[PDB]
Amino acid sequence: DVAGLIPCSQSDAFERRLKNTTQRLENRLKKYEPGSAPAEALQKQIDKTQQRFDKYRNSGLLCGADGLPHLITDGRWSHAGEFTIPGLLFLYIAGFIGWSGRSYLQAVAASDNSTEKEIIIDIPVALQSVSKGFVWPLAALQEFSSGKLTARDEEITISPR
Amino acid sequence: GTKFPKASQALAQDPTTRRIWYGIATANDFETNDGITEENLYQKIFASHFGHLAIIFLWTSGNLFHVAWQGNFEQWVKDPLNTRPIAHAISDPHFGQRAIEAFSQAGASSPVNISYSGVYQWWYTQGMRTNEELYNGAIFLLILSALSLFAGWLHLQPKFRPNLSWFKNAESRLNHHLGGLFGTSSLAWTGHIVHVAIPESRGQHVGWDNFLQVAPHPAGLQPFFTGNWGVYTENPDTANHVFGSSDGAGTAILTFLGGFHPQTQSLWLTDIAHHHLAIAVLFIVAGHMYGLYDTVNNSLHFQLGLALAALGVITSLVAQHMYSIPPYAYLARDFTTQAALYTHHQYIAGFLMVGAFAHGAIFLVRDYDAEQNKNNVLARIIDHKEAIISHLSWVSLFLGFHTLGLYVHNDVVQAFGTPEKQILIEPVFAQWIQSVHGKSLYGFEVLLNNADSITRVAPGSAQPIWLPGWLDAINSGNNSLFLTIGPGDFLVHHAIALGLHTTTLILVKGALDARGSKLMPDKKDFGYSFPCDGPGRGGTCDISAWDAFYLAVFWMLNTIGWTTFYWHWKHLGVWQGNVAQFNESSTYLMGWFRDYLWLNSSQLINGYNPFGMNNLSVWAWMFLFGHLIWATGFMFLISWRGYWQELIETLVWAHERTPLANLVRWKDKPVALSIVQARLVGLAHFAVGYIVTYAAFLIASTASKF
Amino acid sequence: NLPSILVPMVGIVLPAIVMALLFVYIETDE
Amino acid sequence: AHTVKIYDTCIGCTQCVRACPTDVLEMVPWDGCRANQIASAPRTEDCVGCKRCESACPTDFLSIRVYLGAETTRSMGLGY
Amino acid sequence: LADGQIFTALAVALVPGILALRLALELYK
Amino acid sequence: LRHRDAIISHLNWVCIFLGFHSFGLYIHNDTMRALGRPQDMFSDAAIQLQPVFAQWVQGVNSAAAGNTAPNALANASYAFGGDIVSVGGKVAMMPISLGTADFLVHHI
Amino acid sequence: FSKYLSTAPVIGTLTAFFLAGLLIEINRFNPDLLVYP
Amino acid sequence: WLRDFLWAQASQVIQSYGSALSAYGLMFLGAHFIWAFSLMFLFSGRGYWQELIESIVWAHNKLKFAPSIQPRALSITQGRAVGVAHYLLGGIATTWSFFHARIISVG
Amino acid sequence: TLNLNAPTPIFGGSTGGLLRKAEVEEFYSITWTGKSETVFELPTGGAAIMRAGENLLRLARKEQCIALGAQLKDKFKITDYKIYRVYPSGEVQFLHPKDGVFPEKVNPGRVAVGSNKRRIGQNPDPAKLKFKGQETFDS
Ligand code: CLA
Ligand code: CLA
Ligand code: CLA
Ligand code: CLA
Numbered sequence A: 001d002v003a004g005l006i007p008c009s010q011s012d013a014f015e016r017r018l019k020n021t022t023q024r025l026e027n028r029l030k031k032y033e034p035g036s037a038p039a040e041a042l043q044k045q046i047d048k049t050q051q052r053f054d055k056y057r058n059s060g061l062l063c064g065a066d067g068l069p070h071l072i073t074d075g076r077w078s079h080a081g082e083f084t085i086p087g088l089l090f091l092y093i094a095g096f097i098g099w100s101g102r103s104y105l106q107a108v109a110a111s112d113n114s115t116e117k118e119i120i121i122d123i124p125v126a127l128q129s130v131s132k133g134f135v136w137p138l139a140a141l142q143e144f145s146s147g148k149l150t151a152r153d154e155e156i157t158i159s160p161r
Numbered sequence B: 001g002t003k004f005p006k007a008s009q010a011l012a013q014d015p016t017t018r019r020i021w022y023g024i025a026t027a028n029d030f031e032t033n034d035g036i037t038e039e040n041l042y043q044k045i046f047a048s049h050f051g052h053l054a055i056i057f058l059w060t061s062g063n064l065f066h067v068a069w070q071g072n073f074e075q076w077v078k079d080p081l082n083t084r085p086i087a088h089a090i091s092d093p094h095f096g097q098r099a100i101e102a103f104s105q106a107g108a109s110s111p112v113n114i115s116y117s118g119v120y121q122w123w124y125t126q127g128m129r130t131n132e133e134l135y136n137g138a139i140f141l142l143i144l145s146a147l148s149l150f151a152g153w154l155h156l157q158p159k160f161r162p163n164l165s166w167f168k169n170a171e172s173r174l175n176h177h178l179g180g181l182f183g184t185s186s187l188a189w190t191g192h193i194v195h196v197a198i199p200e201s202r203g204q205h206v207g208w209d210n211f212l213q214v215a216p217h218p219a220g221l222q223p224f225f226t227g228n229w230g231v232y233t234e235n236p237d238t239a240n241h242v243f244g245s246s247d248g249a250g251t252a253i254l255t256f257l258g259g260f261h262p263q264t265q266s267l268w269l270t271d272i273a274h275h276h277l278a279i280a281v282l283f284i285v286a287g288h289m290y291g292l293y294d295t296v297n298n299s300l301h302f303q304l305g306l307a308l309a310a311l312g313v314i315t316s317l318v319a320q321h322m323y324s325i326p327p328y329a330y331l332a333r334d335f336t337t338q339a340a341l342y343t344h345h346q347y348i349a350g351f352l353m354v355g356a357f358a359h360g361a362i363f364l365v366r367d368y369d370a371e372q373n374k375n376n377v378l379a380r381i382i383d384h385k386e387a388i389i390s391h392l393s394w395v396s397l398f399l400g401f402h403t404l405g406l407y408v409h410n411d412v413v414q415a416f417g418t419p420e421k422q423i424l425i426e427p428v429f430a431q432w433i434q435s436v437h438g439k440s441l442y443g444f445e446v447l448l449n450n451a452d453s454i455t456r457v458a459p460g461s462a463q464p465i466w467l468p469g470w471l472d473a474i475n476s477g478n479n480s481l482f483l484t485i486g487p488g489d490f491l492v493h494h495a496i497a498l499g500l501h502t503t504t505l506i507l508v509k510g511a512l513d514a515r516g517s518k519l520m521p522d523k524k525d526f527g528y529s530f531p532c533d534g535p536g537r538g539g540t541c542d543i544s545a546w547d548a549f550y551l552a553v554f555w556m557l558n559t560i561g562w563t564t565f566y567w568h569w570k571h572l573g574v575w576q577g578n579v580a581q582f583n584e585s586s587t588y589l590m591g592w593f594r595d596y597l598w599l600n601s602s603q604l605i606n607g608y609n610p611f612g613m614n615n616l617s618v619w620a621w622m623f624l625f626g627h628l629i630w631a632t633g634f635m636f637l638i639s640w641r642g643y644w645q646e647l648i649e650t651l652v653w654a655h656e657r658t659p660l661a662n663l664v665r666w667k668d669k670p671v672a673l674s675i676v677q678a679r680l681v682g683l684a685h686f687a688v689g690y691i692v693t694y695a696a697f698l699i700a701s702t703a704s705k706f
Numbered sequence C: 001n002l003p004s005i006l007v008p009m010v011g012i013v014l015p016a017i018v019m020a021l022l023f024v025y026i027e028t029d030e
Numbered sequence D: 001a002h003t004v005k006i007y008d009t010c011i012g013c014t015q016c017v018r019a020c021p022t023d024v025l026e027m028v029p030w031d032g033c034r035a036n037q038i039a040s041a042p043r044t045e046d047c048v049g050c051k052r053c054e055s056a057c058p059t060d061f062l063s064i065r066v067y068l069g070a071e072t073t074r075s076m077g078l079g080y
Numbered sequence E: 001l002a003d004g005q006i007f008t009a010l011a012v013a014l015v016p017g018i019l020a021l022r023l024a025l026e027l028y029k
Numbered sequence F: 001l002r003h004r005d006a007i008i009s010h011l012n013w014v015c016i017f018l019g020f021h022s023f024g025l026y027i028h029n030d031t032m033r034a035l036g037r038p039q040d041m042f043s044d045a046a047i048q049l050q051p052v053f054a055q056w057v058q059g060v061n062s063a064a065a066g067n068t069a070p071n072a073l074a075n076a077s078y079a080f081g082g083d084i085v086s087v088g089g090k091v092a093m094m095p096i097s098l099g100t101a102d103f104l105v106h107h108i
Numbered sequence G: 001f002s003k004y005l006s007t008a009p010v011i012g013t014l015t016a017f018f019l020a021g022l023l024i025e026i027n028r029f030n031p032d033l034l035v036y037p
Numbered sequence H: 001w002l003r004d005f006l007w008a009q010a011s012q013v014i015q016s017y018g019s020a021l022s023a024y025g026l027m028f029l030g031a032h033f034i035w036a037f038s039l040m041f042l043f044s045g046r047g048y049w050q051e052l053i054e055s056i057v058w059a060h061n062k063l064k065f066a067p068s069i070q071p072r073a074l075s076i077t078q079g080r081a082v083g084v085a086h087y088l089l090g091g092i093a094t095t096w097s098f099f100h101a102r103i104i105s106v107g
Numbered sequence I: 001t002l003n004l005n006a007p008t009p010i011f012g013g014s015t016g017g018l019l020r021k022a023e024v025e026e027f028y029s030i031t032w033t034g035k036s037e038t039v040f041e042l043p044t045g046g047a048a049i050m051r052a053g054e055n056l057l058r059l060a061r062k063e064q065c066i067a068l069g070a071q072l073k074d075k076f077k078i079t080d081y082k083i084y085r086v087y088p089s090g091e092v093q094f095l096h097p098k099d100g101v102f103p104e105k106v107n108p109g110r111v112a113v114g115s116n117k118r119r120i121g122q123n124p125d126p127a128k129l130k131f132k133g134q135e136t137f138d139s
């Protein structure tokens, strides 16, 4: 109850999203033979909806007038699993991709022909960079504090003013 | 060679068709005329402004005159709820018999147009009741236009030509415009409301023939000087009151009730009077007060760009506040003109804002003197220009990847029969603000929802009396004062945000790179608008600052489109009292395609068909008309000059070699449109088509179901 | 009644006059 | 006609001159050394504005620059 | 309205009709 | 290559001729339907533009069974003319009749 | 041929084949993951 | 041609969500997207995007990791080809989706 | 001079050549000696046959005479082509080579026309040259 949203375990509309879904498939099961291969294809499909709804009731989600789960991003710690917990999960993986390719290009550029090493990927140098990418929140802090994370604006190419 | 165009002798020597086109385009670009001195330039601007003012005056005189002569204002005033306002009569000789019977609507015996400009609801509130008061407005504006036209001619005569110093006398202009133009005009408008608007709303007729006899308040103008100002807050109008009569009418002329009149569903006239009086005071006080600021003063483009930005911001403001806070009686009840008024002003606002950045870029290439502009705010924004653009680039990409991603996510998940798997984020920061303003629906219970909070109690002076009227309207589900929002509103608001950031990005990058970039270091030497710099250096199409504005016109239309698409669909459910359609379908894009565009186009597309025609045949024809001219713009935008110039050459050959036609000759050699010209012509077709298509649909879809 | 006279003037006759006036003005020369 | 200006960064490579489709440019003796050559534009009235010259200039940012101006029968490239 | 009020309004509109022609041929010069 | 201006400009004329005299007959028909004049457009209950050069070919190809292709039991197809063939409940093939609306699209 | 596998399109496809098929197997055993429980 | 053909017969490609015809409805909107995405390349030109990239190679030079393969905008002839590809891919697959979901449902 | 008249090559064709602009103002002529009887493309269409000659061809633009003159030096190695522009209805005789030497070669006696004694970054601002008769690029 943060925006007039009843929880989904108490929402009477969220229960009626279960009732018409399994009625659309049990009517889809009424024409087939009971032991056939499309029979077990819809019974495994019905039980996927039962593992869908019974997961969403116990998870503590908030259902509105239509009966769908809503996400509350102001981040509260009672609703941290909607955006806050997958948010920290994203940024590590995204920063691992970022700090690997940044450290790969710095290792490649101080070589003989750095341009061909963007076509061909040096598997020793690439695996050296994914070792440096797992420690990106610790490696970028000492790269920023020592001053070699950024260049000054007199070293960057810059348009005429 | 030829005299036309007068403004540019170099165009005048062009022997091809390009001369006429460019002579039309470079005509009101006074700065690039031949021999035009700074002093002569300013005097021409001033006079051109008088001409524009007169046109505005004539335009609204033409709306008054046609309404008084061919409208149904007198019939409308009697029953605003059921009378359809008439714009003007229809005199199109091409009409047939059944088509005259279809457009002879609103109880008329001639074909006429149902008006959607809202002029009836604006004129009514001011106190007009009969056609003869309307006609008196038209003749007066005719004189004011003639006063405007004569004055422009007058201030061009030798003895009356203003000096250069007068136009650049900045401090005098701010004082006089804030004081006079804004302040005393607002003060005068308070005079009209207490002496005319308020009396006519209480069933008492006050006109020029008697206004000097009757008083706006029982014993007014002795409490004003003696300081007993509180007497004007005597007995207001009761909730039972019927607008335009004395039943339930009070005598107050300045109040602070808040909210809306329960019958008209719009602001109280007496409440509007106090607002203008207060606003008047603010401007009159501020009007007694009167590097970077010198470069504002020497560049007409800098001033115009800021004046377009200032007008563009408040043009959007007018749209946002008129739909949620209706200021004209019975304007909330006619849903089609409220749809028209929001869309109209939002598109104008988009043009102004885009134009503001356009004239800003013109300033940087033609007026910005980088040697006389060092170490100030202007020369510092150009100094880290790539930082600003790169960040604007990031936010657009950030917003775009994710908002589209959620829509595509929802679409797939809804297509597969599992709507429960959608990602729906509640607009909690917004819903907090509505509870901060008093909306007790979400129950957040802090500031003006908390009954003991300092903002509702105010123990310093016991001020808070705007609260009762405001809270009744914001909590009753009968208006648009802070409409209920859900997951659908969240996604669109980020789409609109995506549009505002991307449109600004195109305009900001174009302006900051106007003087030069790595691909074109000397760009400033070629001016604001030039074709390109050839196929060398990799290719340089669309490298001029003008082309950046050109690309941004596509993004603003898309942005203002998403704004107007959202406002229309949401209000459509709200006006039908079935808000569930928008709330559930707007979270996936197929809902916007099936339940908004396809669903509401049922009647519009049937304006005429093999079985007959109805009063929507015009809008149905216009709808198709818009699609054709939109698509015609794509021709100029996709196909470029070269294909056409070579094609035209075969036509020149063919004409010269065919007897009975050879005999006659062109005076101007035919040539393909220019590179810049085509972009402009294509965009103009595109954008005229964009607006004309949506205007036809918006008006017809809402007028069909109400 | 006056609609029946005026809308072919500014619809047909008056655009024929100003297009005639602008076309000679374009193709004049010194 | 279009205006074609030649800046003092020219290295006398002759590439621009040999790119021009209407023979607007030629190499002339330079007096700053009496040894090298600079590009010139003596026949700008025949310049069509194709910009083939600049696309042939090797120097990092052009030594010859074509600023499109007033159009004429010659400049519009008309055979009519 | 009345029929005479229409021709009164077209009679007034010559004064902006001449003063626009007086301004536009002055703005041209 | 020596008369390529004669080919293109004659192809230029026939595109603008066909563009007006096919697509403009819809713009006429949009305008006639909108203005309440269904008797002024190009239709079958209006100014007819009948496909007589195609309806004749519909006649000489549907009457060749036993006449000019004599050993054929039926025609080349049922599109030109003949009976309807129904497999189950649905039409397999039937005479596709041409009219003013078919004249309009064939010139598009 | 192993030198050919380090070239950008084929090494960019099989990891795009790997990072897809990771998410295909994750959604197969663990279906309908809106939130973190 | 708009009311009785493109509006009425596209009622089975947009009401296809929740059935076996749903991927044609996803391809219907999926091709409306790429068709409009083509006009980003068709209406525009290269020299805008080359200077937009010049600020983006700046922020990759700012944090010291810019690629030695220098980022360039597409060529003029290529941006015409990228636009005409997505125009046809977005245009035909709209007609692929509208035709398929219609006649499966009616025939 | 022009040596008009000279034998036009054995061509017979080209709709795309020398229309009404030629008789009112400024058509062009290119004169070369072809030391063979070979076929060569025209700027209009493609063939004629090159005469022994004294060959002469009347073209519409100066562009087409250099575009044909580049073909005679590339394919047939005859670099003695001589473009012209005609008398009373034309303007200026002997357009190329103006100094008798091809413009890619340096020749003493020519003057530097259109030279700027700076770079382009040293060009002044357009705001510095506002409301004046001076141009931003001119020296
Ligand atoms: C055959 C096509 C056709 C034509 C020629 C017309 C013509 C007209 N219709 Mg229309 N109409 C049509 C189809 C047509 N209709 C259809 C199919 C429908 C749906 C059934 C309608 C529904 C309809 C309605 C509802 C109304 C009309 C009206 C009119 C009249 C407008 C009079 C006017 O002020 O024009 C002047 C035109 C303008 C001011 C706009 C033109 C602006 C120009 C092109 C922009 C460029 C300006 C630029 C400076 C160019 C230089 C111009 C300069 C040389 C003069 C005019 C007679 C109106 C009317 O009755 O008025 C009395 C009206 O209210 N018609
Ligand atoms: C009051 C505000 C204001 C003022 C005084 C100006 C003034 C100027 N602008 Mg600015 N500008 C503005 C707002 C303003 N503009 C807005 C709102 C935009 C965004 C649209 C712009 C974007 C802009 C650009 C990109 C440029 C200017 C330029 C100019 C200068 C020359 C204009 C000219 O001669 O074009 C000639 C006028 C035309 C070609 C008008 C024809 C096009 C119209 C839109 C066709 C309308 C279609 C049709 C009639 C619709 C019919 C309906 C249909 C259904 C039939 C002049 C100083 C130019 C300049 O170089 O400045 C130095 C320039 O390049 N403006
Ligand atoms: C906006 C101004 C306007 C007005 C008022 C009209 C009015 C008319 N048009 Mg329309 N038309 C217009 C613009 C306009 N048109 C435009 C812009 C287009 C291009 C889309 C068309 C395309 C069009 C076509 C194809 C046709 C019309 C026709 C008609 C007429 C139908 C009724 C009729 O025949 O009466 C019966 C009356 C008569 C037949 C005679 C009326 C007077 C005639 C026209 C002139 C008599 C000569 C007069 C002495 C001197 C000439 C006047 C001139 C110099 C100003 C009606 C007079 C129809 C028509 O009859 O054409 C003439 C017709 O076939 N129009
Ligand atoms: C729907 C949008 C649209 C329209 C209407 C056009 C129209 C045209 N294209 Mg274009 N084209 C388009 C999109 C469009 N194109 C796009 C998006 C591209 C990019 C790929 C192109 C690329 C392209 C090329 C490469 C070529 C064309 C050519 C043509 C012309 C063909 C000949 C013809 O039919 O003339 C007749 C005109 C029409 C049928 C237009 C409708 C006119 C109506 C029916 C009549 C007018 C009514 C009234 C009199 C109007 C004025 C009233 C007012 C003055 C009062 C025609 C003008 C070709 C061409 O020029 O050949 C000569 C050509 O080679 N186009």
Ligand SMILES: CC1=C(/C=C/C(C)=C/C=C/C(C)=C/C=C/C=C(C)/C=C/C=C(C)/C=C/C2=C(C)CCCC2(C)C)C(C)(C)CCC1
Residues within 6 Å of the ligand: B302, B305, B306, B309, B310, B313, B356, B357, B359, B360, B361, B363, B364, B508, B511
């Ligand atoms: C490029 C350029 C340019 C342009 C620019 C522009 C055009 C701008 C725009 C911009 C804009 C146009 C901006 C705006 C802004 C605004 C703002 C930022 C606002 C804010 C607001 C506020 C602050 C408010 C608040 C509040 C609220 C909300 C409620 C409560 C209370 C208060 C009242 C506090 C120029 C010309 C200079 C020139 C040079 C270059």
Ligand SMILES: CC1=C(/C=C/C(C)=C/C=C/C(C)=C\C=C\C=C(C)\C=C\C=C(C)\C=C\C2=C(C)CCCC2(C)C)C(C)(C)CCC1
Residues within 6 Å of the ligand: A073, A074, A075, A083, A084, A094, A095, A096, A097, A098, A099, A102, A136, A140, H063
């Ligand atoms: C918490 C939260 C929130 C909020 C948020 C915010 C408000 C934030 C902000 C943020 C910000 C405001 C930020 C800023 C930043 C800036 C900067 C300046 C940055 C930088 C960066 C960098 C430098 C990077 C680097 C890197 C890395 C680290 C890795 C990879 C690679 C790269 C290179 C990329 C919300 C409500 C949503 C929800 C709940 C939770």
Ligand SMILES: CC1=C(C/C=C(\C)CCC[C@H](C)CCC[C@H](C)CCCC(C)C)C(=O)c2ccccc2C1=O
Residues within 6 Å of the ligand: B635, B636, B637, B639, B640, B641, B642, B644, B645, B671, B672, B673, B674, B675, B678
């Ligand atoms: C069709 C076309 C042409 C050919 C069109 C030309 C040369 C002009 C044709 C317009 C004629 C004159 C009809 C104009 C009809 C308008 C309604 C007239 C408006 C005039 C205003 C002044 C009111 C180009 O030259 C061109 C150039 C570059 C890119 C795209 C294109 C392009 O698409």
Ligand SMILES: CC1=C(C/C=C(\C)CCC[C@H](C)CCC[C@H](C)CCCC(C)C)C(=O)c2ccccc2C1=O
Residues within 6 Å of the ligand: G012, G013, G016, H040, H041, H042, H044, H045, H046, H049, H072, H073, H074, H075, H076, H078, H079, H080
């Ligand atoms: C948007 C746009 C661009 C910019 C678009 C560019 C530069 C295309 C770049 C986008 C691609 C997708 C970058 C791909 C980068 C890597 C190949 C990604 C590899 C990822 C692996 C995991 C596979 C132009 O260059 C252009 C040029 C001419 C006319 C119009 C336009 C135009 O519209």
Ligand code: SF4
Residues within 6 Å of the ligand: B531, B532, B533, B534, B535, B539, B540, B541, B542, B640, B675, H045, H076
């Ligand atoms: S002609 Fe077209 S492709 Fe060539 S430089 Fe100009 S805009 Fe670019």
Ligand code: SF4
Residues within 6 Å of the ligand: D006, D009, D010, D011, D012, D013, D014, D015, D016, D017, D038, D039, D053, D056, D057, D058, D059, D063, D064
């Ligand atoms: S201008 Fe450019 S092409 Fe010409 S000589 Fe100088 S460097 Fe060479």
Ligand code: SF4
Residues within 6 Å of the ligand: D004, D019, D020, D021, D022, D023, D024, D025, D046, D047, D048, D049, D050, D051, D052, D053, D054, D066
């Ligand atoms: S623009 Fe073209 S014709 Fe003119 S000098 Fe340069 S290359 Fe020669």
